[PDB]
Amino acid sequence: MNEAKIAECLQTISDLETECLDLRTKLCDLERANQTLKDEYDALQITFTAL
Amino acid sequence: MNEAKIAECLQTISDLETECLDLRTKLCDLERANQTLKDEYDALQITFTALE
Amino acid sequence: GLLYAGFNQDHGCFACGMENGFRVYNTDPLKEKEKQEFLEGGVGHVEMLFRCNYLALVGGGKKPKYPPNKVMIWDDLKKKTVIEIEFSTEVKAVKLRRDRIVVVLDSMIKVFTFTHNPHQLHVFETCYNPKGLCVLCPNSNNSLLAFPGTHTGHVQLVDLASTEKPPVDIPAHEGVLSCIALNLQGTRIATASEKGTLIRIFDTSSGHLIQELRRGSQAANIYCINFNQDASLICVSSDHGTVHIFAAEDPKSKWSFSKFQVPSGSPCICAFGTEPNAVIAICADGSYYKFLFNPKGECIRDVYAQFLEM
Amino acid sequence: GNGLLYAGFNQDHGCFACGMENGFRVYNTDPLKEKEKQEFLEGGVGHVEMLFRCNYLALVGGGKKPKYPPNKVMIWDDLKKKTVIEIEFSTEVKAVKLRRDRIVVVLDSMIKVFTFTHNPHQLHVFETCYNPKGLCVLCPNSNNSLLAFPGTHTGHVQLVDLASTEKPPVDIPAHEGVLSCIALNLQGTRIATASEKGTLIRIFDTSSGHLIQELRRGSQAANIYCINFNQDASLICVSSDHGTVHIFAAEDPKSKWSFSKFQVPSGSPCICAFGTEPNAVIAICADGSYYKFLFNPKGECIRDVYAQFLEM
């Protein structure tokens, strides 16, 4: 029925929103780690240019 | 009508699909760049540890 | 018992925090859109993200559903909380965009990622902000955040996309701020002090004064300011439930051309309706009013309802 | 003929897609209903992989006049009615398998895994034996990233978890002869296999590679066309040459042979899956015949539905 179509679409939307939340979370988490490793690359680079 | 809510939902799904694709692209792009840097770190690390 | 009322970003909806949960309503025409019951207690703040499935909830009332130092992101399609952020102090308001959660406390504003584990991005200090005065542009291309500065009567504006730039600081009033409002485009900010005799509209990019408008000679507590769609008009609520309507772009017309009294006199928030000459009043007693004005500045009351009862 | 070039079920058998000499069509399996029809005047699609009931389809050009070069994979967005991602290869594509986060492309000699992104990045390459049928199954479930394909040794199946690729693959010596068919259950916990001898179907645990159940279809050789599990994996359906369909009970010590089977009267080769009723089996044949059969505990089969799905 027409209502049944609504139910599928609403379910699709909730699952899609869940995925955006998960992707954004994984993206922001990885962005932080990358910057932390960017810093361990500068600090270690200056160490081995000092040596 | 009740059909109008179908049209709105279809637009929301289409837009959400684009955002998922964009986010996973940015995520996979960064995941690869991190691995490239995870390599250069260990590279420079062992390289000049042997220098010591 | 009504505990909170607030318009969404386009005023197309308003949300109510209740002693027994939350409700969402379409502003014009008025229609109840959602009802969520909690046997365990109240919600003291509800922030919509437009017409999305996300709501920000803060516990409040005599028996709050959540501790008042926590922000709860509600997923309305799943009917559950999906993100929790805990603070050392009470939450006074929340503002949402798709990529940021902004939490207003009594004396600082914190900006977080909208993620399952929100990360704090920025902290801005404010003066004592018991009203939770803060506006955040909801537009994807404009990240403007505006809030009370550390100096009395100042407004601080921050672009959340360019936070390395020095903020624009606006000496908007000589006294404590009572109300702040952005237009939909995020190009104008309206302000009032606790003296409430003057509303000043500024350009958000330069901080320049665009208009100084007068509500009257005597003092008044300003409850609400909102722009219409084109920002050509502002509506302004004050004590006694009066609503003043001003021309925002006409320097020749600084006093209200039109005004009406809400017959119950209860404090109310106001916004423009879907019709260009409609203004809506949502009152703390539960009264809803729609008034139509005409170009002569005459006002007639068109609609009245108890939205809490339908 | 009728212009059909390909037929394939989606991940839950709720739909099947058809590659045509002039485009593609999507159908709901039970009840049979044409769901989408996209015509291309310029040529055919020789492979169509659905992602469940999402708007994404993987298309590979095929036929006498292919709509796309056969060395390219096209992700079709059916809500936008356009191609949105293209990946080009040095060799012809034999099959595609989709999950929400990975595009898996099957070539004759290898399996390449890509990100499902606007610019796909190659993640893994697995070598296979000569795989002209494009035998590969990929768990669509979010909690199981299992990829299964023909190993480099005849009759072996190599199993890789795409979430833990640092672990050694499980290698299953499934048959003494060339593999002809591979199927996962919906949970991705069981894998069914057949050789070109087609006398035996063997079901393995995908985590340990251990043989759970050996089912004998017959003594004589048969080309096995298709294997599918039912929703609970208690049953499997098996298609063979001449269009027979065999129905067996998996995971039951009380099974070794078929409790039911029917012949497709036209004898054309068909793929098979279970219907919405626990005792329904569906057969889609290369001639364009659709059959739904109901079986009983005695193993008798009755026909419930018959249609030519290509005329709708």
Numbering used by the authors:
A (entry chain C): 126 to 176
B (entry chain D): 126 to 177
C (entry chain B): 12 to 263, 282 to 339
D (entry chain A): 10 to 263, 282 to 339
Kindly provide excerpts from the paper associated with this entry:
The recruitment of the ATG12~ATG5-ATG16L1 complex by WIPI family proteins is a crucial step in autophagosome formation. As a key autophagic protein, ATG16L1 interacts with ATG12~ATG5 conjugate through its N-terminal ATG5-binding domain (ATG5BD), and further assembles into the hetero-hexameric E3-like ATG16L1 complex, utilizing its dimeric coiled-coil domain. Structurally, both WIPI3 and WIPI2 are mainly composed of a seven-bladed WD40 domain that contains a highly conserved “L/FRRG” motif to sense PI3P and a unique loop connecting the two outermost β-strands of blade 6 for membrane binding. Here, we uncover that WIPI3 can directly interact with the coiled-coil domain of ATG16L1.
However, we managed to obtain good crystals that diffracted to 2.77 Å resolution using the WIPI3Δ/ATG16L1(124–188) complex. In the final complex structural model, each asymmetric unit contains two WIPI3 molecules and one ATG16L1(124–188) dimer, which assemble into a unique 2:2 stoichiometric hetero-tetramer. As anticipated, two ATG16L1(124–188) molecules mainly form two continuous α-helices and wrap around each other, forming a parallel coiled-coil dimer. Two WIPI3 molecules in the hetero-tetramer complex adopt highly similar seven-bladed β-propeller architectures, akin to that of the apo-form yeast Hsv2, and symmetrically bind to the N-terminal opposite homo-dimeric interfaces of ATG16L1(124–188), each burying ~598 Å2 surface area. Further comprehensive structural analysis uncovered that the molecular interface between WIPI3Δ and the dimeric ATG16L1 is primarily constituted by residues from blades 2 and 3 of WIPI3, through a combination of polar and hydrophobic interactions. In particular, the negatively charged E142 residue from one helical ATG16L1 chain and E144 from another chain of the ATG16L1 dimer couple with the positively charged R109 residue of WIPI3 to form charge–charge interactions and hydrogen bonds. In addition, the side chains of R149 and T150 residues of ATG16L1 form hydrogen bonds with F125 and H127 residues of WIPI3, respectively. Concurrently, the hydrophobic side chain of ATG16L1 L146 occupies the hydrophobic groove formed by the side chains of Y65, I94, F125, and H127 residues from WIPI3. Moreover, the methyl groups of T124 and T126 from WIPI3 form hydrophobic contacts with the hydrophobic side chain of C153 of ATG16L1. The specific interactions between WIPI3 and ATG16L1, as observed in the WIPI3Δ/ATG16L1 complex structure, were further validated using SEC-based assays. In accordance with the aforementioned structural data, individual point mutations of key residues involved in the binding interface of the WIPI3Δ/ATG16L1 complex, either from WIPI3 or ATG16L1, such as the Y65Q, disease-associated R109Q, and T126R mutations of WIPI3, or the E142R, E144R, and L146Q mutations of ATG16L1(78–206), all resulted in a significant reduction or a complete loss of the specific interaction between WIPI3Δ and ATG16L1(78–206).
